Scaffold this active site. Structure first.
Site, PDB file in Angstrom:
ATOM      1  N   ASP A 156      35.123  44.092  46.094  1.00 39.63           N
ATOM      2  CA  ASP A 156      35.019  42.921  45.066  1.00 39.63           C
ATOM      3  C   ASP A 156      35.316  41.929  45.331  1.00 39.63           C
ATOM      4  O   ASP A 156      35.753  40.595  44.722  1.00 39.63           O
ATOM      5  CB  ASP A 156      34.839  42.537  43.596  1.00 39.63           C
ATOM      6  CG  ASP A 156      33.835  42.192  42.595  1.00 39.63           C
ATOM      7  OD1 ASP A 156      34.349  42.489  41.725  1.00 39.63           O
ATOM      8  OD2 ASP A 156      32.932  41.637  43.633  1.00 39.63           O
ATOM      9  N   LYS A 158      35.904  37.949  46.257  1.00 39.95           N
ATOM     10  CA  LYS A 158      35.039  36.294  45.847  1.00 39.95           C
ATOM     11  C   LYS A 158      36.460  36.504  45.226  1.00 39.95           C
ATOM     12  O   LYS A 158      36.538  36.451  44.466  1.00 39.95           O
ATOM     13  CB  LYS A 158      33.761  36.627  44.854  1.00 39.95           C
ATOM     14  CG  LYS A 158      34.516  37.932  44.134  1.00 39.95           C
ATOM     15  CD  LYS A 158      33.315  37.495  43.123  1.00 39.95           C
ATOM     16  CE  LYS A 158      33.250  38.329  41.200  1.00 39.95           C
ATOM     17  NZ  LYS A 158      31.722  38.884  41.060  1.00 39.95           N
ATOM     18  N   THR A 191      28.883  41.578  44.694  1.00 32.12           N
ATOM     19  CA  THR A 191      27.829  40.329  45.005  1.00 32.12           C
ATOM     20  C   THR A 191      27.369  40.070  46.395  1.00 32.12           C
ATOM     21  O   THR A 191      28.484  40.162  47.143  1.00 32.12           O
ATOM     22  CB  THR A 191      29.361  38.901  44.640  1.00 32.12           C
ATOM     23  OG1 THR A 191      27.973  38.074  43.847  1.00 32.12           O
ATOM     24  CG2 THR A 191      30.405  38.460  45.201  1.00 32.12           C
TER      25      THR A 191
END
Ligand SMILES: NC(=O)c1ccc(O)cc1
Length: 340
Positions: A156, A158, A191
């Site tokens: 994840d 980001k 994402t």
């Protein structure tokens, strides 16, 4: 690598495995804390600033609604998140201080990082200079070297998940998709802008997806926008799998070269996933000015220090509707969350 790195990682894995095999459980309870302010909110949980009533310490409390976790098929992911977080130890990972559950919710009580998310700072400034992006990137490289050596994939990366601490260093938060994986795994998660092609194409994928995401992050930090933008996820995915990326002319040649090797659509040719592993990244010319040990030891002066007034200041986080923390009189989903 130098025996020094080998021995460091061997000890890291020993310590991780001991906690992995015997996880801590039930180390606080809700009424030990006062609620201060909601710092973020999602489809199955939220993060709140709380204060411990006896010590006066502030913490960030992630609260997950067990019934929504079940509905959104996040049971195993939430169990992964807590079991991993209670077992890891590294300078650039947010520390889990307590965990517990009640009839309705799961709770993970973490150190509070008042500087806020990198995302806010990046959007406020526009873009980071290459030295600034490189300072953050080096921390992620070391963090992934650590996690991958423990057989952990993060999944994840980001800017929203990278908190800026009081010294200007990164704390990675949100282990909701992190998983202990020997070999391959298959879940569609992450994402859209950060997904590697092999996730999009439903393959059995490995830690190389984290190195792809690092390429996306470095590009976004240095440009101000990610490499594969579009209005619909499907259009983002088409760009990701295409094998094409365009670079701003202000990027250095060294930056472009590194990014072509991280944003390599053939996972068997991607930096971080070759025989030399992380050293292909750490020895790349874009990182020639990086003193890896000094970064690890937090001895490098940071690009900036967030502005905040003290450990209870919430100014670097935004405003959300303040909703109840309701605890049912009846236990929900007890079986599913037994190990938490
Ligand atoms: N640890 C923290 O300070 C924190 C803050 C906000 C989040 O959304 C997640 C974590």
């Amino acid at each position: 690598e130098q025996e020094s790195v080998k021995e460091f990682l061997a000890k890291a894995k020993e310590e991780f495995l001991k906690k992995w095999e015997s996880p801590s459980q039930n180390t606080a309870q809700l009424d030990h804390f006062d609620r201060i302010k909601t710092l973020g909110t999602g489809s199955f949980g939220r993060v709140m600033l709380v204060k411990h009533k006896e010590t006066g310490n502030h913490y960030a409390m992630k609260i997950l609604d067990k019934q929504k976790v079940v509905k959104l098929k996040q049971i195993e992911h939430t169990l992964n998140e807590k079991r991993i977080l209670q077992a890891v130890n590294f300078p650039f990972l947010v520390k889990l201080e307590f965990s517990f559950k009640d009839n309705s919710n799961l709770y993970m009580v973490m150190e509070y990082v008042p500087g806020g998310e990198m995302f806010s700072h990046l959007r406020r400034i526009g873009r980071f200079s290459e030295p600034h992006a490189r300072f953050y990137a080096a921390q992620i490289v070391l963090t992934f070297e650590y996690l991958h050596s423990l057989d952990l994939i993060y999944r994840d990366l980001k800017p929203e998940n990278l908190l800026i601490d009081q010294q200007g260093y990164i704390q990675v938060t949100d282990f909701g998709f992190a998983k202990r994986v020997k070999g391959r795994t298959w879940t569609l998660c992450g994402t859209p802008e950060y997904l590697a092609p092999e996730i999009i194409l439903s393959k059995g994928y490995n830690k190389a997806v984290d190195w792809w995401a690092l390429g996306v992050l470095i590009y976004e930090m240095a440009a101000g926008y990610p490499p594969f933008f579009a209005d619909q996820p499907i259009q983002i995915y088409e760009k990701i799998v295409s094998g094409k990326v365009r670079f701003p002319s202000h990027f250095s040649s060294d930056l472009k070269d590194l990014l072509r090797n991280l944003l390599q659509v053939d996972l068997t040719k991607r930096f971080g996933n070759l025989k030399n592993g992380v050293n292909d990244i750490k020895n790349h010319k874009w990182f020639a000015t990086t003193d890896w040990i000094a970064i690890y030891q937090r001895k490098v002066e940071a690009p900036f220090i967030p502005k905040f007034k003290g450990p209870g200041d919430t100014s670097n986080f935004d405003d959300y509707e303040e909703e109840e923390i309701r605890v049912s009189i009846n236990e929900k989903c007890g079986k599913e969350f037994t190990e938490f």
